[PDB]
Ligand binder design. Structure first.
Ligand SMILES: O=P(O)(O)OC[C@H]1O[C@H](O)[C@H](O)[C@H](O)[C@@H]1O
Ligand SMILES: O=P(O)(O)OC[C@H]1O[C@H](O)[C@H](O)[C@H](O)[C@@H]1O
Lengths: 156, 156
């Protein structure tokens, strides 16, 4: 049972609703950060930042951000200090986001997948463990340090 | 002809050399930020931060970050202030990254695509114009302001 913060704009809104239901039915705890209704002109960054901020503030939780293409949503989420947001476009990439990047969040482009495909991605994301492998941790650490100082690490 | 800053770790290294060749042959200006050799144990963040930093520092340029899965690489690039790095997993997502997100960078997962698929992704990214549509600019602006102030925009 994972806690999962969900954020979506209008383009991800109906998929977000289906994912909430799916997560409830599969033993997890979805928390809706908005949008709480369909507003055709609404702007994804607020909801992505909301979901990412909550996820980083609640260590051990996960987050999913949803819009049309997934890319703006993950870009926005990655601007939150400490957040690592992968773009999940397949079951394999959702799994690797957890296993290699210890990604707390994924973005999913609601316009790029059928509901069934999207729910399979969600499943992979919420069930795949972080490997804790030394090299993966080292790379996350290097990034975390860069976030702290904004000093670009040297290239060999 | 675009200027394109390229970064890669060992997993994206061979694909990078291939993309450099392709960009030269198609009238563009690639600039290699490393890795300059195959090193099986090397760490993607420095190469991605390097490419993203150079790209943001040179308005009008684009950048491409390359690794195994693409996701760690775009996460790293997105930590650079002002950088918008999309995960390009298809010709469509490469195109929309430019059209909708005015993304200066894409990440590509070398282990996820054939060379021919990757090069078609590259072509879409370096030839698709930014739309400049009001709503897309507004969202990019909202994100830039969050980046500047870390004041999370309010959610309805
Ligand atoms: O405003 P519309 O619905 O056309 O587009 C909204 C979408 O724009 C871009 O594609 C963003 O990456 C994001 O996915 C957002 O959901
Ligand atoms: O160290 P190895 O080669 O197993 O993996 C390296 C890869 O790790 C992760 O997948 C990152 O997202 C990135 O794609 C990197 O290139």
């Amino acid at each position: 049972g994972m806690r999962v913060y969900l954020g979506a704009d209008h383009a991800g809104y109906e998929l977000k609703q289906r994912i909430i239901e799916h997560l409830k039915q599969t033993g997890h705890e979805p928390i809706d950060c908005g949008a709480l209704r369909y507003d055709a002109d609404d702007d994804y960054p607020a909801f992505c930042i909301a979901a990412a901020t909550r996820t980083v503030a609640d260590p051990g939780s996960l987050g999913i951000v949803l819009g049309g293409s997934g890319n703006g949503e993950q870009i926005a989420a990655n601007k939150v200090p400490g957040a690592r947001c992968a773009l999940a476009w397949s079951v394999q990439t959702a799994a690797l986001a957890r296993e290699h990047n210890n990604a707390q969040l994924i973005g999913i482009g609601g316009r790029m997948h059928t509901v069934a495909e999207a729910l399979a991605i969600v499943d992979a994301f919420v069930t795949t463990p972080w490997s804790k492998a030394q090299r993966h941790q080292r790379r996350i650490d290097i990034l975390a340090e860069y976030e702290r100082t904004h000093e670009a690490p040297p290239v060999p």
